[PDB]
Design an enzyme around this catalytic site. Structure first.
Site, mmCIF file in Angstrom:
data_model
loop_
_atom_site.group_PDB
_atom_site.id
_atom_site.type_symbol
_atom_site.label_atom_id
_atom_site.label_comp_id
_atom_site.label_asym_id
_atom_site.label_seq_id
_atom_site.Cartn_x
_atom_site.Cartn_y
_atom_site.Cartn_z
ATOM 1 C CD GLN A 9 -3.081 -0.848 2.167
ATOM 2 O OE1 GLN A 9 -4.099 -0.294 1.726
ATOM 3 N NE2 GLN A 9 -2.930 -1.189 3.460
ATOM 4 C CB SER A 86 2.550 -4.678 4.413
ATOM 5 O OG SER A 86 3.347 -4.284 5.509
ATOM 6 C CG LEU A 87 -1.305 -5.868 -0.754
ATOM 7 C CD1 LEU A 87 -0.510 -6.132 -2.031
ATOM 8 C CD2 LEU A 87 -2.223 -7.044 -0.408
ATOM 9 N NE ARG A 111 -2.161 -7.631 5.347
ATOM 10 C CZ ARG A 111 -1.585 -6.435 5.254
ATOM 11 N NH1 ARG A 111 -2.019 -5.507 4.408
ATOM 12 N NH2 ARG A 111 -0.544 -6.151 6.025
ATOM 13 C CG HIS A 191 2.274 -3.023 10.859
ATOM 14 N ND1 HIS A 191 2.163 -4.335 10.452
ATOM 15 C CD2 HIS A 191 1.822 -2.269 9.829
ATOM 16 C CE1 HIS A 191 1.699 -4.366 9.217
ATOM 17 N NE2 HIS A 191 1.490 -3.129 8.810
ATOM 18 C CD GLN A 239 2.487 -7.485 7.750
ATOM 19 O OE1 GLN A 239 1.294 -7.209 7.959
ATOM 20 N NE2 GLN A 239 3.328 -6.629 7.162
#
Length: 281
Positions: A9, A86-87, A111, A191, A239
């Site tokens: 992102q 991440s993604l 997600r 996070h 994560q």
């Protein structure tokens, strides 16, 4: 040895993937099947700026990353390692054969929903300070509800926590030599163990899927080490409530003997990070 790096992102842009949708019609149609809208239209036309809304951003980036990978596999030797920010981890796991294209897309749709629905706190991206200095500043300014959320390069750190504390830290960070301090357009403080409820929910959701072993190693954001075949659910669910150890993941690969790092997806975000990690290391 070569690694592919998959962006997440923030790297999206209107018009991304055009040539890939043309090249991969079967995957485009299958993506549409999961999502219930035209993935090409989302990426090309960006209707109502939905590309900036995380529930749409995540599927868009997963699809463009996945197709970008498949284009590279047709044209170049296979990579030795994979890592995603991440993604981007979901595209990396797709590339590694851990799940099929549609399954990965369903996981990212979920997600996106969990993250779009999350509430509480915020995040700021900091440019120009190292981890040690950021930690020192958090303590000096009494920001006990803020933590480091991403370690992206030696000079690029993201912090996460209480919205009022994230706001109040801006000037002190700038005064300490931050070249930039930017409050992120996010729903919540991602996070940190603050996001534990969403982590738990995502873990439970992942129990309903059946995974295959990675055919190419994928370096986990959580551990900065290769994902264990038996540990996919922990890697992905934890994560969202754990610091993203991107810098360490790249350094691990460098230490393993990887000399070529290629960004696989739209844009040059991870390429920029890599240049900074490489220069320091």
């Amino acid at each position: 040895m070569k690694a592919y790096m998959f962006p997440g992102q923030g790297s999206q842009a209107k018009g991304m993937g055009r040539a890939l949708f043309d090249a991969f019609p079967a995957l485009t149609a299958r993506a549409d099947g999961v999502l219930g809208y035209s993935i090409r239209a989302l990426c090309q036309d960006d209707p109502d700026q939905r590309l900036s809304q995380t529930q749409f951003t995540q599927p868009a980036l997963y699809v463009v990353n996945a197709l970008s990978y498949l284009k590279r596999r047709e044209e170049e030797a296979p990579p030795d390692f994979l890592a995603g920010h991440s993604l981007g981890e979901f595209s990396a796991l797709f590339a590694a054969g851990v799940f099929d294209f549609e399954t990965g897309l369903a996981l990212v749709k979920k997600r996106g929903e969990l993250m779009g629905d999350a509430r509480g706190g915020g995040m700021a991206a900091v440019i120009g300070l190292d981890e040690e200095r950021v930690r020192e500043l958090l303590d000096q300014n009494g920001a006990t509800a803020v933590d480091i959320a991403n370690l992206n390069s030696p000079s690029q750190v993201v912090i996460s926590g209480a919205k009022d504390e994230i706001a109040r830290l801006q000037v002190p960070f700038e005064a300490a030599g931050a070249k930039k301090y930017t409050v992120l357009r996010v729903s919540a403080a991602f996070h940190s163990r603050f996001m534990r409820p969403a982590m738990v929910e995502f873990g439970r959701f992942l129990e309903g899927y059946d995974f295959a072993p990675p055919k190419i190693p994928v370096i986990s954001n959580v551990t900065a080490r290769p994902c264990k075949a038996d540990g996919i659910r922990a890697a992905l669910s934890e994560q969202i409530a754990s610091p993203v150890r991107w810098c360490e993941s790249i350094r691990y690969l460098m230490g393993r003997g990887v000399e070529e790092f290629v960004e696989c997806g739209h844009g040059i975000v991870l390429t920029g990070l890599y240049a900074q990690i490489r220069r320091d290391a």
